[PDB]
Structures are given as C-alpha cells and as structure tokens.
Amino acid sequence: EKMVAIMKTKPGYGAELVEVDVPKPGPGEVLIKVLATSICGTDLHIYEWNEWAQSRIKPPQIMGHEVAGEVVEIGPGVEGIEVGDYVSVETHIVCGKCYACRRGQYHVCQNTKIFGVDTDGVFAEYAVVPAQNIWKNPKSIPPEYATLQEPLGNAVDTVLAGPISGKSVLITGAGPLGLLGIAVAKASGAYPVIVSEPSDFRRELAKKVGADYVINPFEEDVVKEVMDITDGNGVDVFLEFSGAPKALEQGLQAVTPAGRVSLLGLYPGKVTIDFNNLIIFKALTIYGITGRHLWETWYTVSRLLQSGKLNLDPIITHKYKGFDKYEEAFELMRAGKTGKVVFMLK
Numbered sequence: 093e094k095m096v097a098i099m100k101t102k103p104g105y106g107a108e109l110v111e112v113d114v115p116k117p118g119p120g121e122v123l124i125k126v127l128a129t130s131i132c133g134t135d136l137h138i139y140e141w142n143e144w145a146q147s148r149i150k151p152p153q154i155m156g157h158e159v160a161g162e163v164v165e166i167g168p169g170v171e172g173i174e175v176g177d178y179v180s181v182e183t184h185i186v187c188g189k190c191y192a193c194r195r196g197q198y199h200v201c202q203n204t205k206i207f208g209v210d211t212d213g214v215f216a217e218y219a220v221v222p223a224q225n226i227w228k229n230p231k232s233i234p235p236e237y238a239t240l241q242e243p244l245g246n247a248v249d250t251v252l253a254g255p256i257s258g259k260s261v262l263i264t265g266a267g268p269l270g271l272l273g274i275a276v277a278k279a280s281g282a283y284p285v286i287v288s289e290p291s292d293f294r295r296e297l298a299k300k301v302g303a304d305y306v307i308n309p310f311e312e313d314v315v316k317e318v319m320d321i322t323d324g325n326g327v328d329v330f331l332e333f334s335g336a337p338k339a340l341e342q343g344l345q346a347v348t349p350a351g352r353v354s355l356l357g358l359y360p361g362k363v364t365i366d367f368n369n370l371i372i373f374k375a376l377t378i379y380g381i382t383g384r385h386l387w388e389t390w391y392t393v394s395r396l397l398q399s400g401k402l403n404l405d406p407i408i409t410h411k412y413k414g415f416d417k418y419e420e421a422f423e424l425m426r427a428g429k430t431g432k433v434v435f436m437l438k
C-alpha cells in the first residue's frame with residue numbers, strides 16, 4: 093500500500109522524496125510497476141520552478157514521464173493490455189475530437205493534456221496511466237533504453253522528417269535530444285553528420301556517439317567550417333536541437349539551397365531572421381517538430397532499438413539505483429554535466 097515517489101509538494105525550488113499510497117487504476121487506466129525512468133529537461137524546469145512551471149504545475153504532483161515498466165493491474169473496461177506486459181508511455185493525452193485529431197495529427201491535438209505535467213508522473217515505484225497511452229515494448233529492449241523512447245521519438249521525427257540516408261547533416265546542440273539525433277541520423281545512413289556544440293563535455297559525447305565532425309561555435313565560424321566540409325555547397329539537412337537563436341541563423345546560412353530544415357529546439361523568445369535571403373531565396377523546406385506521431389513514430393523508434401544500430405551507451409552518462417540521489421541527479425543536469433540520467437528500480 094505505500095510507495096516512494098519524487099514529488100513536487102509545493103511551489104518553490106526542488107522536490108521531496110515521500111511515501112504515498114499506491115494509486116488504484118480506475119476505468120480506462122492501468123497500473124504499472126516502474127522498472128526504469130529518466131529525467132527530461134521539462135522535469136528539470138519543474139524542479140527549478142521557472143516561469144513556465146509556475147504557470148503550469150499545480151502541486152502536489154508526482155514528477156517524471158519517461159518510463160519503462162510492467163503492467164501489474166488493469167482498471168475496469170480496459171481491453172488489449174494484460175498484467176505482465178512490458179510497456180512505456182506516450183505523454184500526449186489527446187481528445188480524439190478536434191480538427192487536428194480527426195486529420196490524424198494527434199501530436200498537435202488542440203486540447204492536449206500532458207502526462208506527468210498535467211497529471212502525476214512516473215518517478216515513483218508505481219504509476220497509473222491512461223490505457224490508450226500505453227505502448228507495448230518488445231522484451232528484448234532493456235529498460236534503460238526503453239525509458240528513452242519519448243525523447244528518442246522526438247529525435248526520430250526531427251531527423252526523419254525528410255530523406256536522410258546519404259545526406260550531409262548539420263546538427264546544432266548536443267544536449268540529450270541532439271545526442272539522440274546523432275544516434276538516429278548515423279543509424280539511418282546520414283554522412284557527414286556535423287555537430288555544433290559549445291560545451292566541451294557534450295561536444296566530446298557527440299563524437300563518441302558518432303558525429304563525423306564537431307565544431308565549437310564559441311571558437312570557430314560554423315558556416316565557414318561547414319562550407320569546407322561540403323565543398324562550398326552546404327549541408328542537405330539542418331536539424332536544430334539547441335534552441336539558441338544564433339544556431340538557427342547559422343544553420344539557415346549553412347544549409348544548401350533547396351535543402352531541408354527540422355526545428356525541435358525552443359528559443360528564449362521571438363527570433364529575428366533574414367527570411368528573404370535564407371528561407372525564401374534558398375527555397376527551403378522547414379518542419380517544426382513537436383511530440384511524436386502516434387503511433388508511427390513509436391514503431392520506428394522500437395525497430396531502431398531492436399536493430400542495435402543506435403549508439404546509446406555513451407549518452408546514458410548516469411545510472412542511479414533508486415531515487416535517493418535525485419538531488420545530485422538534478423544538480424548535475426543543471427550544471428550541463430550530463431547526457432541522460434536513468435533511475436533504475438528494484
């Protein structure tokens with residue numbers, strides 16, 4: 093009847109490790125036992141209690157949303173899920189009713205609620221989950237990889253928004269999302285994959301994951317280096333994984349005419365851009381990326397996991413046993429000292 097949870101108990105910095113009642117799954121819900129769980133930048137912002145989290149979180153609430161778990165209990169009415177199923181969780185809870193949903197664009201549902209943001213999450217021993225947000229995992233995939241499927245899906249949709257095999261690529265940003273992008277891009281045949289990242293630690297991770305070239309944009313002229321690599325032609329594909337305004341401008345300069353751009357990173361505010369010369373006169377195709385395409389992106393992610401071609405080990409920089417060191421985990425992330433952190437549960 094009791095379980096450990098990482099909990100945002102009240103407004104302010106940080107979180108508390110508490111013991112609470114194991115939830116009961118009601119109609120259309122299942123209860124999973126958590127096997128592995130990982131920390132998202134969203135979780136960090138809730139911990140730090142920034143302006144966004146202030147506008148969005150009602151304490152008290154269990155934190156976290158990336159998960160690998162086992163179904164232990166089914167709520168009434170639930171079909172198609174059985175006790176013992178190995179599962180992960182899609183966080184967009186969609187209405188099924190708006191124009192976006194009815195066109196099959198669930199990832200931009202007009203009435204979206206976010207699991208672990210608008211609801212209790214998964215940094216706990218057990219979690220209740222809407223049954224329609226359950227993804228069944230093949231048993232071959234280890235929990236430490238299965239827990240990365242949400243951000244891995246974001247990375248898949250950014251990388252694969254167009255053709256990528258045999259394409260030259262610039263990635264700006266090698267935080268966890270960008271690192272996962274590198275892994276996806278290399279497993280999908282991109283070369284050369286050029287990665288721009290000012291942090292020395294993350295830039296070296298990008299190389300271990302598989303970047304063909306790395307660039308420190310605080311010391312090197314990104315666009316000039318990219319012109320050297322691509323013999324003056326620019327990259328076929330530009331993937332923006334940093335949310336830095338200057339990186340957006342560099343990638344739009346570095347991309348080949350009529351090339352393709354995917355934008356995942358989110359900027360501190362509005363950006364000021366030369367649309368005439370960089371987007372219009374270059375005839376670019378630009379994709380904004382958010383969420384995951386439900387369920388095609390999850391099938392793609394699942395096969396890429398099973399193929400063994402994603403080089404994910406270098407990205408998991410910290411694997412903790414249970415939740416006791418959550419304070420240290422969140423502080424290391426804040427410091428930029430991380431790839432992904434995984435909590436492993438007994």
Ligand SMILES: NC(=O)c1ccc[n+]([C@@H]2O[C@H](COP(=O)([O-])OP(=O)(O)OC[C@H]3O[C@@H](n4cnc5c(N)ncnc54)[C@H](O)[C@@H]3O)[C@@H](O)[C@H]2O)c1
Nearest residue numbers: 133265267268269288289334335336339356357358382383
């Ligand atoms: N739905 C979405 O569009 C969605 C989903 C997931 C994440 N995100 C966003 O994706 C971005 C990446 O997420 P993350 O968790 O990996 O973030 P993160 O902050 O850990 O990493 C961003 C990286 O960008 C690097 N960087 C800063 N300035 C740069 C510059 N000028 N050029 C190149 N790199 C630079 C930083 O050093 C950092 O390593 C963030 O903006 C995040 O908000 C968006």
Ligand SMILES: [Zn+2]
Nearest residue numbers: 187190193201
């Ligand atoms: Zn909808």
